[PDB]
Design a protein around this ligand. Structure first.
Ligand SMILES: *[C@@H]1O[C@H](CO)[C@@H](O[C@@H]2O[C@H](CO)[C@@H](O[C@@H]3O[C@H](CO[C@H]4O[C@H](CO[C@H]5O[C@H](CO)[C@@H](O)[C@H](O)[C@@H]5O)[C@@H](O)[C@H](O[C@H]5O[C@H](CO)[C@@H](O)[C@H](O)[C@@H]5O)[C@@H]4O)[C@@H](O)[C@H](O[C@H]4O[C@H](CO)[C@@H](O)[C@H](O)[C@@H]4O)[C@@H]3O)[C@H](O)[C@H]2NC(C)=O)[C@H](O)[C@H]1NC(C)=O
Ligand SMILES: CC(=O)OCC[N+](C)(C)C
Lengths: 149, 92, 209
């Protein structure tokens, strides 16, 4: 609450009862009649905590909150099929450059085409992901390594 | 077709690159025109027709390069096609 | 009305969630639904009943992309964990929408078939042309670009793979293998011959044909 504070309102988790014993609902409720399964994200954990900041003043708005967390795992098969496998196959095509005869006059063409395809894939993924500088994405690291090679 | 039927002849390269350019133009049209399927734009039909023709040009270039690079040590010359291309087609 | 009967017909633009099934795309039928019910009044307090078994499509502006092949409304009573002693009523209207594929046939399927056809031409194209590799690589690049097109048109949901996407991946693997074997052929053409190679390709193969 912003209109009220820990001095005015006490936040708490919903209590529920089983066998006439009460317990706090320390998790996000998922109702099988109301819930729709997301096709990308599997909910691994869904905890709930009442957070109290002891250093915050009792009359501050930030002293108390209830935070619900969704620890969701991506279902990767879509990206494995559509992105990772084509990118790896086209990347490994560069290994054929050594086997192609120098009399063919197409070895640079193959290598530069593989580089262009890798650049296009890097363009795609950089659109699908935020420009966060915290870490390089795994497929982005693979693409950079492949382009260097 | 006017490009040489011999090594250094970029016939297939040119044909496929022009096909790719027409595909890029198809992408441009697909963006400016709605996804509605009640009819196909005549400009889009023209693009598709030109792409089909370009693929047939690629096929014809491949056939021409095959015939030109054939050798008596590996292929028996067909008398019908040889006589046709030698006399009957130029004199047609 | 003087009988107390109220008729209310408010307009709305519902942006409802629908599970888009990608498998048969772009020939897919989509089954999209609208679960409508009284939020706070339960079935013992306010009972909602469907006006008709089917939605009223008499004023439906015909869409240029989707054909409603079927529509139906089903009333349900369900018990939520919020409210275990009081079942809540809803009417789930649903519409079976079939995509008109012509736009996607023109702009995706036909080009993909055209570039797919260009794959096999590499084996009739002689090595001495030097066009084999450029041709096959350009086909591979175009197929990759069209796969990137398809992946943008389709949700990243991993419940099921599309069939055009599966076909595109299969064609990608086929083109990669074709390029590998083309490189083998080119290296062979520029090459002591082992007895098995001569026996297979010079003796056996032409004798069987
Ligand atoms: C596209 O997707 C949509 C959804 O997104 C999907 O819609 C479903 O469509 C099917 C038919 O194709 C629907 O199935 C029918 O549902 C009818 C309604 O069933 C409900 O109501 C029943 C009413 O009975 C009593 O209900 C209460 C008591 O609870 C009481 O107050 C009432 O007065 C009434 O007496 C109820 O029985 C029924 O219960 C079902 O569910 C419970 C638990 O979920 C289960 O225990 C029951 O056994 C039963 O399954 C439910 O609450 C229903 O009348 C109808 O029955 C006919 O067909 C069946 C066989 O199919 C016969 O046995 C029966 O005699 C009837 O002929 C049928 O079951 C379904 O409800 C829709 N679901 C939704 C969510 O909308 C479309 O089909 C999809 N279309 C595609 C893919 O093309
Ligand atoms: C009491 C109340 O507001 O219930 C709303 C939730 N619902 C409609 C799923 C039961």
């Amino acid at each position: 609450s912003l209109k009220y504070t820990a001095k005015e309102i006490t936040l708490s988790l919903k209590q529920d009862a089983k066998e006439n014993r009460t317990y706090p609902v320390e998790w996000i409720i998922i109702d099988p009649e109301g819930f729709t399964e997301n096709g990308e994200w599997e909910i691994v954990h869904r905890p709930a905590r009442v957070n109290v900041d002891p250093r915050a003043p009792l009359d501050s708005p930030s002293r108390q909150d209830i935070t619900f967390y969704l620890i969701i795992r991506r279902k990767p098969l879509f990206y494995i099929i559509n992105i990772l496998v084509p990118c790896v196959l086209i990347s490994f095509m560069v290994n054929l450059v050594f086997y192609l005869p120098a009399d063919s006059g197409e070895k640079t063409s193959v290598a530069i085409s593989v580089l262009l395809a890798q650049s296009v894939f890097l363009l795609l993924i950089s659109k699908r992901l935020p420009a966060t500088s915290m870490a390089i994405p795994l497929i982005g690291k693979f693409l950079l390594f492949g382009m260097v090679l | 077709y006017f490009l040489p039927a011999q090594a250094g002849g970029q016939k297939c390269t040119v044909s496929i690159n022009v096909l790719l350019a027409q595909t890029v133009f198809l992408f441009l049209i697909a963006q400016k025109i709605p996804e509605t399927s009640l009819s196909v734009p005549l400009l889009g039909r023209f693009l598709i027709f030109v792409m089909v023709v370009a693929t047939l040009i690629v096929m014809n270039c491949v056939i021409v390069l095959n015939v030109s690079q054939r050798t008596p040590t590996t292929h028996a010359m067909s008398p019908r096609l040889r006589h046709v291309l030698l006399e009957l087609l130029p004199r047609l | 009305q003087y009988t107390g009967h109220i008729t209310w017909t408010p307009p709305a633009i519902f942006k409802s969630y629908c599970e888009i099934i990608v498998t048969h795309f772009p020939f897919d039928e989509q089954n999209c639904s609208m679960k409508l019910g009284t939020w706070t009044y339960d079935g013992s307090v306010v009972a909602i009943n469907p006006e008709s078994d089917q939605p009223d499509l008499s004023n439906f502006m015909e869409s240029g992309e989707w054909v409603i092949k079927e529509s139906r409304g089903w009333k349900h009573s369900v018990t939520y964990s919020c409210c275990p002693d009081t079942p809540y009523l809803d009417i789930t209207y649903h519409f079976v929408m079939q995509r008109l594929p012509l736009y996607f046939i023109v702009n995706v399927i036909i080009p993909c078939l055209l570039f797919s056809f260009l794959t096999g031409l590499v084996f009739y194209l002689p090595t001495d042309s030097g066009e084999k590799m450029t041709l096959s690589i350009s086909v591979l690049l175009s197929l990759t670009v069209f796969l990137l097109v398809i992946v943008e048109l389709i949700p990243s949901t991993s419940s099921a793979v599309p069939l055009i996407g599966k076909y595109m991946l299969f064609t990608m693997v086929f083109v990669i293998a074709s390029i590998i074997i083309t490189v083998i052929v080119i290296n062979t053409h520029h090459r002591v011959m082992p007895n098995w190679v001569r026996k297979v390709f010079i003796d056996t193969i032409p004798n069987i044909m």
